Design a protein around this ligand. Sequence first.
Ligand code: NAD
Ligand code: NAD
Ligand code: NAD
Ligand code: NAD
Ligand code: CL
Lengths: 335, 335, 335, 335
Amino acid sequence: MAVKVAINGFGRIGRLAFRRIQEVEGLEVVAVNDLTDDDMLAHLLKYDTMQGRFTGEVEVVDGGFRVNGKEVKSFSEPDASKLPWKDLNIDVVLECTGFYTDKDKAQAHIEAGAKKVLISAPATGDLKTIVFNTNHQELDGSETVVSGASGTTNSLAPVAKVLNDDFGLVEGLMTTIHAYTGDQNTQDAPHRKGDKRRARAAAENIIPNSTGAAKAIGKVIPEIDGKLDGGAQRVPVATGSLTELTVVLEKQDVTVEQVNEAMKNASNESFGYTEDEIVSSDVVGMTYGSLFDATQTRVMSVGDRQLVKVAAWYDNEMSYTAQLVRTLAYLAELS
Amino acid sequence: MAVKVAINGFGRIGRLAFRRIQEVEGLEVVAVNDLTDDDMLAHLLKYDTMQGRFTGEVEVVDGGFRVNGKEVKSFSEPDASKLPWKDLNIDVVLECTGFYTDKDKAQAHIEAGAKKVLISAPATGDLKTIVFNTNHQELDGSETVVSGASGTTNSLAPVAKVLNDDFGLVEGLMTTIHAYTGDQNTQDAPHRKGDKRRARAAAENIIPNSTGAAKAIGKVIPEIDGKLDGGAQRVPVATGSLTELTVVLEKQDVTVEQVNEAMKNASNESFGYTEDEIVSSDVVGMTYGSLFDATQTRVMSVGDRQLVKVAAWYDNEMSYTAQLVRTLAYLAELS
Amino acid sequence: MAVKVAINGFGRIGRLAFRRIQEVEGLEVVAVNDLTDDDMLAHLLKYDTMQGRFTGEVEVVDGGFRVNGKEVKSFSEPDASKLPWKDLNIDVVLECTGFYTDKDKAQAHIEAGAKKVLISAPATGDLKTIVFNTNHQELDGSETVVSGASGTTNSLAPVAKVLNDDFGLVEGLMTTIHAYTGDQNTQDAPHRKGDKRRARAAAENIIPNSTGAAKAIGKVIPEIDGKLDGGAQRVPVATGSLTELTVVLEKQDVTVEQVNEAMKNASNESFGYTEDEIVSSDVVGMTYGSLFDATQTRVMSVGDRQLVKVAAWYDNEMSYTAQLVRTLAYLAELS
Amino acid sequence: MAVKVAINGFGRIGRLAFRRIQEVEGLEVVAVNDLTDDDMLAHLLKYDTMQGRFTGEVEVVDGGFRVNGKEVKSFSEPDASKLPWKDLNIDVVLECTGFYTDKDKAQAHIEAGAKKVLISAPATGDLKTIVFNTNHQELDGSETVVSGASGTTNSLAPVAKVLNDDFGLVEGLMTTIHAYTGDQNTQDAPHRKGDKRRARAAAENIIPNSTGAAKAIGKVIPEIDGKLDGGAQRVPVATGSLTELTVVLEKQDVTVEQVNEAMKNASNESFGYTEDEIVSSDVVGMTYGSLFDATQTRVMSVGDRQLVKVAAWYDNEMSYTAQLVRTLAYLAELS
Ligand SMILES: NC(=O)c1ccc[n+]([C@@H]2O[C@H](COP(=O)([O-])OP(=O)(O)OC[C@H]3O[C@@H](n4cnc5c(N)ncnc54)[C@H](O)[C@@H]3O)[C@@H](O)[C@H]2O)c1
Ligand SMILES: NC(=O)c1ccc[n+]([C@@H]2O[C@H](COP(=O)([O-])OP(=O)(O)OC[C@H]3O[C@@H](n4cnc5c(N)ncnc54)[C@H](O)[C@@H]3O)[C@@H](O)[C@H]2O)c1
Ligand SMILES: NC(=O)c1ccc[n+]([C@@H]2O[C@H](COP(=O)([O-])OP(=O)(O)OC[C@H]3O[C@@H](n4cnc5c(N)ncnc54)[C@H](O)[C@@H]3O)[C@@H](O)[C@H]2O)c1
Ligand SMILES: NC(=O)c1ccc[n+]([C@@H]2O[C@H](COP(=O)([O-])OP(=O)(O)OC[C@H]3O[C@@H](n4cnc5c(N)ncnc54)[C@H](O)[C@@H]3O)[C@@H](O)[C@H]2O)c1
Ligand SMILES: [Cl-]
């Protein structure tokens, strides 16, 4: 039958990965783990502020919940090493808690009996960081623990690859205007990780913040390692984000048209192209990992010296989740 | 010299109580306790999203911080029983963590050496619940643990008293349209206390939620115990709230004017009166505990049967804080 | 073939009425009028911040736009008396500009050649005010200008009817906690109609405001004329709203359960029932005119005197639009 | 006595300039013009969602309003050529309506009798564009119509000057993450100027949009004419903005520290310097034209090739307004 998936952390990425799996044959979520009870899990699956009402039926049953007639087993175990993955025969854990973002920590799922772990974030340790349709083919099926990178990395990789392949990337700087996330406080309050900015009221501020997306791009595209860096501004939309990239290229006399054309030629189910004057809410729930926006391309030329600026939208939620689940499927399929 | 105050929980209420104590002679905050470091505390005192920049100078120093030339000792101790209150000679603890909202739990501060505790919230146990300028005179100086009630209770009490004194309260229902607070999640997520509504994205929803304010009004005004109940709708403003009360009265043929008049006559530093067409942002940072809005008075008469509706604004932060600090001062002065 | 509909004012209600007519056979929108060009119209139809991407294809063509292979003629004419309705054989104008909310003013469409007008708001003059599934049967086919009421009226009517039929309505008061609309300013600015509250930053305040919904309920349910009144708080969500109604009933010893069952028994495609602890975003895009929320029903009893409170959600946009289009269909079919 | 000022367009910039003039001696606002009545004007002066309650007393009087005992005459006249500026002896009109942003159009105030006009925006035609403390010394007193530039320009100019003087500006690109403003729609609607992005729900989207600030910088700093370009993202905060500038410099091996120090050395009352990890609400109401944020400086070095990124905050309202008022004072003082 299907690939057996357990989701660890039924949060934003967890539940959306659950929804998305509902429309990909060969994958079944058989178990979910988190820190709450079934009443709350079922409820947050059914209702979603940004992504909309869940389409199927959800019902609390014994030991978990039923979704469109399928039993999902649920657990409330903060220590992953104690999860009953061996008895459940879990083929892949989707690790979406935010607390196991390291090869050695995530290993706990393997000890508990899962065959492989896919982490919904950048992760430290000796493992591959994968953006689907940019470098998934670097997976060979011997990996046990894999990172699915970040929303920002997924928005940036296909854009950066085209810039480098077609024009030769000398260097660039990124800013991501990014929806606020669960890691920010509702009101000004002490922040768990001592970040004085993620401390502030999330929905009432433009908030500068760091991201590894550009700095660690070299893990996704080794041939440009060290050539990008940048940061983020977290702003008050609840999901939907934009990556602006300003670069220096080797090729001279570059034009808006050549850049846009090159992006369009690279488009697929991960990397979308648009020429419509859209805004963030238009990309909520979209399944492209990156939507290239040709209306935002600019070229500064002073004499023979040029800066090239481009921008790609991503739903930091659904865009990333759709990539995560593509990498999931590919990863499972290799065994 | 001054009354020695320690603040437990340097959060929204804690920091604002600190600010407000800066302009009230005879009160000095000598200690603060929370779960973070000085860098974070100093920072959140200096900067405040809704309430504005702190006016004085704040500098991180050894074992705490200096504010306008005064040393504040700071601690990072979750178990209150362990705080050095005896060494510091604490006269009153302002208990503003949200975790000691009960007479027996709050007792921990007394064991630790504080003479008295004032809790920035409704609290269970055998103790007095005080709304300044409605029933603060019920304090005699033999109390060790006192509750300052809630924001909503302070908004409501003075309105409820006038209605009862002047018209005879038969019964009523309340809804507070309330700013969202720190116990709501930033994004849809499991809620610590299992509340499926406080679980939702705070700044993106109208959220029905409970409040004891009306049900427990009888602790502040015994003679109307059991006559009020109601709830809240948490909405996306970061601070600033409104209490609507709909009531049945014993007196007949009541008019809008008679109600407004009676409210105006009862106005003081705690209970304000306005006839201007204001909106929530207008009351941010105000120091009335309750601002009666005459433009919102409504009287429904069918034959000889009437419903009377009124509304009072409050800054759930600063209004409550100003009331809290008035009570603190009165409380400390009684010994 | 189909009934020929022209939409006047391609705004929030106009474009959603357009979307909604795409899925109701026997109605075709053949013309649209507004104050802009086709580029803008096509665009606002394609992309909708709260209601999501339009599903079909939209293309600017000559003299209007093409939707799913169908030609829509578009005009840019502020004076309705000059629209080419006679030439286009318009059966019904859906009047959604906010500028023709009066029988005599709306008469301009009839002079221009439309057979009938349906107004997407309360309207003054000698005409029927219709809430589908509460009093649409009051239409006999001799009306030329009809009002579809307001979102609030549509949320309230079916609730008020069950209350009266099953308990005897004595009197009541309403508050609707309501998403902000286009008649509010983005920033504090002079307000076109002199309302000092609708003048304020819409997305940054809780804003009291008037509404005729309750006061004029007797146009929809004559037997309770004069027994309801109340107002609105406009709050920062971009669509989705809640009506709170506090009532006195002739029936004594009423329980929460009795009220809830009576509501459930009246449910249909206009009046939904829920027991889930939902929040405003959960109703965005729903097609019930009114969603009764059983979780919010309260009964305050003091001796034999009771106040009953209930609450019904409505997407002020899509709920109202769904009702408007049901009324449109029924209206057109009577001829 | 004082310089006589009239404010045309008592909008955000108009009212804030009015407040700010209350604390600059030698300036008196004697008259205000807009399109509303006195009730509305007085009210919007008193109450301000982001900027707070006005401190003095405001009272509607005959033919205007009284502020702190001073009579302000008010008018309701859309055609500036008809304003009674000669009878009032206006020395300067502050042109803040957004409808006279051109030398020839603004001439109308001169014909009506004003001696000089200062425009609260970029303006076309033969006139000087002034950022106070960057180029106000280019004013000689023979100017009759002057532009105060934009908030963005005022944020950018001092930053760009330091970059050019100390390192040699080769070229650069700018993005401003900007609070939404009054020219955006509350809900998705046709936009007055045909802009399909400014058409969208302002407080629910990240919205790319154009700005002349970088492109026209050469009007403020001639020696870098043509070297900058860029755009804006309008995001959901009601006021408070950030300018990010990414540049190529002549000087090689530039460091973060060198850049920051050079910015600190240039600081004055128009150009602030900070090393605190602040967020947008922290700059609401600040009087710096530009607040340089040292924590956001980055230097990307690949071999011998560098990009330098910096960022400066501004309250697009109060920062701009304080700059406008300083230019007003200097302008009037030259005659
Ligand atoms: N845009 C995004 O939200 C986004 C995009 C890509 C990746 N990510 C990453 O994915 C991860 C999750 O992000 P999120 O936004 O979904 O966070 P979230 O807070 O919504 O989800 C975390 C969930 O996991 C649960 N959890 C926490 N500790 C646990 C434990 N020890 N055992 C079991 N369950 C536990 C929490 O209760 C919560 O339900 C993070 O690493 C985040 O950085 C987020
Ligand atoms: N926010 C309001 O509108 C408001 C109004 C009236 C009353 N209150 C009440 O005041 C209390 C706190 O309110 P708040 O909004 O400031 O909460 P908050 O979210 O700001 O948190 C308060 C602080 O308590 C600290 N804390 C938590 N546990 C602690 C511990 N064990 N020891 C020491 N410090 C600890 C937290 O780190 C935080 O800084 C609550 O009881 C609340 O209901 C709040
Ligand atoms: N939006 C809601 O929540 C809601 C709910 C129920 C009823 N309504 C009512 O429907 C009507 C429209 O509401 P909306 O919120 O969709 O407004 P809106 O501002 O989005 O739409 C009005 C549209 O009509 C256009 N218009 C204005 N004058 C015109 C004219 N003279 N000729 C042609 N076009 C013109 C405007 O350009 C705009 O597109 C109002 O009466 C409103 O009260 C609104
Ligand atoms: N909002 C900002 O951050 C900001 C910053 C710098 C400059 N500006 C510029 O300042 C100008 C005004 O901006 P705003 O945001 O205060 O706009 P606003 O809409 O808030 O105020 C404009 C005012 O002009 C009045 N008005 C319009 N036409 C008029 C007429 N011809 N005669 C008399 N009064 C008229 C309106 O009633 C309104 O009060 C614009 O040119 C704008 O670009 C805005
Ligand atoms: Cl995150």
